[PDB]
Amino acid sequence: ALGKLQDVVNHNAQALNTLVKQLSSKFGAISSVLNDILSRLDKVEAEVQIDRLITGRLQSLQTYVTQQLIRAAEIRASANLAATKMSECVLGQSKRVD
Amino acid sequence: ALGKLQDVVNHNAQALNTLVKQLSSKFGAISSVLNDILSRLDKVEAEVQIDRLITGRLQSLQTYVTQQLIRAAEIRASANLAATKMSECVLGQSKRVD
Amino acid sequence: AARDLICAQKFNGLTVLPPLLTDEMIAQYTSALLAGTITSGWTFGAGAA
Amino acid sequence: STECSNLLLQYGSFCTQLKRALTGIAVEQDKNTQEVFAQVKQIYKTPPIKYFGGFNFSQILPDPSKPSKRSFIEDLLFNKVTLADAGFIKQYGDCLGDI
Amino acid sequence: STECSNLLLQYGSFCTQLKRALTGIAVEQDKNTQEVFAQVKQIYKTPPI
Amino acid sequence: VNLITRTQSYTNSFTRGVYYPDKVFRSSVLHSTQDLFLPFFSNVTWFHAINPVLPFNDGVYFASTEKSNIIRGWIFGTTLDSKTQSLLIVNNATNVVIKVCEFQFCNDPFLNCTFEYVSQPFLMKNLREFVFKNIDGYFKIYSKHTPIDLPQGFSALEPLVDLPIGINITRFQTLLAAAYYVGYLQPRTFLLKYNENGTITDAVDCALDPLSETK
Amino acid sequence: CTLKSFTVEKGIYQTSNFRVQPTESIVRFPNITNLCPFDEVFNATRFASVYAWNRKRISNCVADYSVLYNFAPFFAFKCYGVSPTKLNDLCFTNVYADSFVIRGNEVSQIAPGQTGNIADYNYKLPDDFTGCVIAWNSNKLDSKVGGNYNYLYRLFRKSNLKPFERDISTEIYQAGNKPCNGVAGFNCYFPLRSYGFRPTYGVGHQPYRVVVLSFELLHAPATVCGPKKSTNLVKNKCVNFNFNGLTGTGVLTESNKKFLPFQQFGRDIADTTDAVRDPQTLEILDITPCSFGGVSVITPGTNTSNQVAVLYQGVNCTEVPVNVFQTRAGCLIGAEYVNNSYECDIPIGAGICASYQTSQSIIAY
Amino acid sequence: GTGVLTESNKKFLPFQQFGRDIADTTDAVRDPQTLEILDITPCSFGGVSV
Amino acid sequence: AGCLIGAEYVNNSYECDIPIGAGICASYSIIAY
Ligand SMILES: *[C@@H]1O[C@H](CO)[C@@H](O)[C@H](O)[C@H]1NC(C)=O
Ligand SMILES: *[C@@H]1O[C@H](CO)[C@@H](O)[C@H](O)[C@H]1NC(C)=O
């Protein structure tokens, strides 16, 4: 019966795990480790590799923020419906069908 | 008391101010001034800098448009609630509690 | 036992803020609403119970 | 910049679909205002008397002395919100003035 | 790292926008939790009978 | 001769020591800069002179409230014994003499190189404030003369010269014919407020207290 | 063309933007007359050693960089912040010519960010090096059959060299823990050694003369300009201007902005130039952009008629050019204003609607 | 890297050298001289609110 | 929520003015409750 709240918890946990697992991507660079890039390459090449990694992680974080905003809109609509149900059906007798 | 109506104007003003202030960021290029880039570098060296600036400003514009779309959806939901309240509270007596 | 997802996301900078109302306060609100409903019907919503 | 415009011609239709989305939002705002307020089919005007069972309606009925036909509480609500955008005509004329 | 931080400062104010959006989401969640439950004015309680 | 001695005391810098970070006009805007600034409410040293060598330590904030034609200038460098490149800045009469050419010279003025820089002198109840810094082989000097003890008011310092010297400076001393204030600059982020006339009228030191961090 | 279709339905469509084009080209440079002595730098007999590198400041002259190919036999420039072809246009504040002699395998050392023995103890460049590096082979001048020992270089130092620092001091290096007391010997190393330059050596150990031109590209008052010719000043007109190498397009007007005497350029919130100082006659000019706005086309369907009306958004009609009605949304051209009021057909602005009515014409009400 | 080194109990097979997290960040190392197994944690941090 | 420095805890219970977390609210000396 509790599948809606379980889906809320699973959605938040899966979004955070996807955001964590996005850190291991190369994003077109030679490595996904900033310390390895800085130890191997010099300043001029390391700036380009670090720039690629910054652009990729910024894109991933923007995608996470957009998905959280849309889910926040959906959750706010559900919370407004729950507040209306509490105001009308708990605090009084409702004649609205179903 | 008028918090939401002030919040609408504040959100629009700070979104436009952030979108204007995004023009000063170099986005990894050698300069944030396009005329300075064109007058300083030659054509082939200037192409990469202008491409980086174009990509950064286009990403900022897409972020602004996505934020405006989500805010417009929230405003449309509030306007539908206001239209329902105008149709039921003003044009008749409502038996719905609270 | 190895490393888990919550410590990985905490070490990478992703935190979870606690809610403002605890479950005890939420249960207190539901108990107050239930006691008002049982002892007064709908009159506590309109005015004094 | 002509070189920037020639580079932006290769980036596709993002530069047009953003305008399309903003035009949709701008149409939807007028749709929202029309749906909220334009519910009555006729403009009913009040009788000149102001005796409705002893109820004082002068604070919410419009004041004819004002040039903007608004009520006292409506003027209070307009004065209590500070709009950041009041001028839409001659904006370039205000911008070209030396300030 | 430090050079990553300097290039992130060159990219501008994306991180402030993301942090502001997440803060607004959290405040909205607190507002929803307040709005659904905190409707009764006084904390009623059941009689012993 | 060693006729000159001096004693030390400690006092508060308050909000003094804010200069223009660039020669670019900005009007009615808050600008967040990050440069070598004197920290707000710091511990500056009051020297009363009637004499060891002072450390430079990344720029020096200098101040005086005495009469005119008392301090004859400054000396910067490492050893200052006509061996290495010692920057002598003699500010007297109607021509300043700034030279990297070292010269053997005592602590008190009377009454290998050929670079002789000359310009207008850095001269005129009244307070004289200077900021010296050395960045990337360039010596930058900011100054301000104001009518008024360090006051609670806010003043802005304007740049005077740029000196492409290139030497390494770690020590300095002043020159005499009374008392002066010595500060020390730190790399900090400032929030400057420009008025309608483009004058820095207020500033916030970001790394002072959490209220200023929030600001 | 905006809709990418041959059929246009009834309504208002935003199409493009009108912009006042620039009329005249203005080039402004200070009236300096001297010629920059690059001939003394490049056409010199004996360059100094890399531990004692020469640094000559060039100022108050017109710089022409095209004669460097005739002055020196170098194959090409190596310019980092600028382009060597575009160097004849923009005007610099200060320029410094550094000069030394190295061998061939360490030219890659003298670059912004690079390390090595020369880049760590002899000559260090700043990370933001906005300048050019010129290196040419000098095997016929700086190489000797018996070995040219005149050129010396630094080996050992207690710390790395800061950018643009000349380490001229010659003391012993204390490699060991015992104090050397200024006496060379075991673990007491003399830090300067000679290049061995012979004509029999390969290309890696051959002598190379290097001149580094560092430009002080700043907003300070510039004094090393190009050979471009200054034109006259034009005010109150949309012109394409070039002020001290700063290009732009706008209307230049007289402004009472109180610049401090050390300030030259005025900036904005978007990091764009809003006010400039004229270098010939010390005047203060505001740069407004040339007039523009949005253009909307108000039309019925193409099945009805091919007559349109044009709405200029936020434009006063008295300044309309690049019937006529004035709205709160802008200036409307091609729609007759009728005092009667009907239902809205095509929305325009603040309570204005246009339709196709009565022969037949577009009316606005 | 920068972190706190701790004596660990992770059972490396003798051919292994490093142990990584989910995000391919190294969190367990072998000392090249004494052949110990060291966990690596990031240093103490947290958000600051006013 | 964390460690609060600079606010003296009080045994009273007021309405929430500045929220912190888990039922803690601070208000102006600055008190938390
Ligand atoms: C009703 O009350 C208002 C109080 O503001 C007064 O101005 C108005 O004249 C009254 N009208 C009548 C009909 O008494
Ligand atoms: C400055 O430091 C000295 C000791 O170092 C101390 O006695 C004095 O109170 C300090 N002054 C200020 C204003 O902090």
Ligand SMILES: *[C@@H]1O[C@H](CO)[C@@H](O)[C@H](O)[C@H]1NC(C)=O
């Ligand atoms: C700018 O200077 C003028 C000079 O008289 C003065 O009148 C004006 O008040 C000043 N503006 C300020 C201080 O904002």
Ligand SMILES: *[C@@H]1O[C@H](CO)[C@@H](O)[C@H](O)[C@H]1NC(C)=O
């Ligand atoms: C360099 O100077 C000498 C001195 O007479 C002159 O003959 C020669 O033409 C100059 N130029 C070159 C490229 O050698």
Ligand SMILES: *[C@@H]1O[C@H](CO)[C@@H](O)[C@H](O)[C@H]1NC(C)=O
């Ligand atoms: C340069 O121009 C200024 C103003 O146009 C003028 O006063 C000055 O005499 C000129 N100098 C020369 C050398 O022509």
Ligand SMILES: *[C@@H]1O[C@H](CO)[C@@H](O)[C@H](O)[C@H]1NC(C)=O
């Ligand atoms: C256009 O601007 C002028 C500026 O004074 C103003 O007087 C005029 O009324 C404006 N035009 C219209 C139609 O309002």
